[PDB]
Write a protein that binds this ligand. Structure first.
Ligand SMILES: O=C(NC1CC1)c1cnn2cccnc12
Length: 185
């Protein structure tokens, strides 16, 4: 690709975070805590899953950012509608306002309904996420493998402002404590 020049500075929005997440002072890293993080509940917080949104809202243009996933067993990344459901159980699908990929149990999948098998030869340590609002496109790139394409959602129906979306995953195994980190430009 050649999308790096639409690079945007993403930061995490503490107020949207699940109450077990720990966001770094610079708002560029997030990890699962071993307990509730002593914050009040609010209507923005994802209740059921270890999710958090970026602070930035996008309604036009082309946007690109990169996320470090080093040594994680499980995660979800992409974008979502600002109006996605926060409370209770839900599936990650474009019908529910999410454009995502994930790692789960040694397989990578795109958040279609039903989910789509990805073919990645080089397990990624960093993921690039590209959004073209006007074109209706969300694309994912393997930064570890010279920027190779992972997946493209096209004909997307955003139907409102978009926010960067993150899921650090549960850590039942003790092997998924590592953070998600927004990578420098
Ligand atoms: O964005 C959408 N689809 C594209 C990404 C694959 C999309 C969002 N809601 N919805 C409802 C019916 C059909 N397609 C949709």
């Amino acid at each position: 690709h050649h999308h790096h020049h639409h690079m945007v500075h993403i930061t995490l929005d503490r107020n949207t975070a699940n109450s077990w997440l720990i966001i770094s002072k610079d708002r560029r890293q997030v990890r699962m805590g071993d307990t509730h993080q002593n914050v009040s509940d609010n209507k923005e917080r994802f209740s059921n899953y270890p999710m958090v949104l970026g602070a930035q809202r996008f309604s036009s243009g082309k946007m690109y950012w990169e996320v470090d996933v080093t040594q994680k067993e499980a995660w979800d990344l992409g974008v979502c509608r600002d109006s996605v459901q926060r409370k209770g159980q839900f599936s990650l699908s474009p019908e529910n306002g999410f454009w995502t990929i994930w790692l789960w149990q040694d397989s990578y999948e795109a958040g279609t309904s039903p989910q789509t098998t990805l073919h990645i030869q080089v397990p990624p340590c960093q993921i690039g996420i590209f959004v073209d609002y006007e074109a209706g496109v969300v694309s994912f790139y393997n930064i570890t493998d010279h920027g190779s394409l992972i997946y493209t959602f096209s004909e997307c129906v955003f139907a409102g402002p978009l926010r960067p979306f993150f899921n650090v995953g549960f850590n039942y195994s003790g092997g998924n404590a590592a953070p998600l980190k927004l990578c420098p430009l």
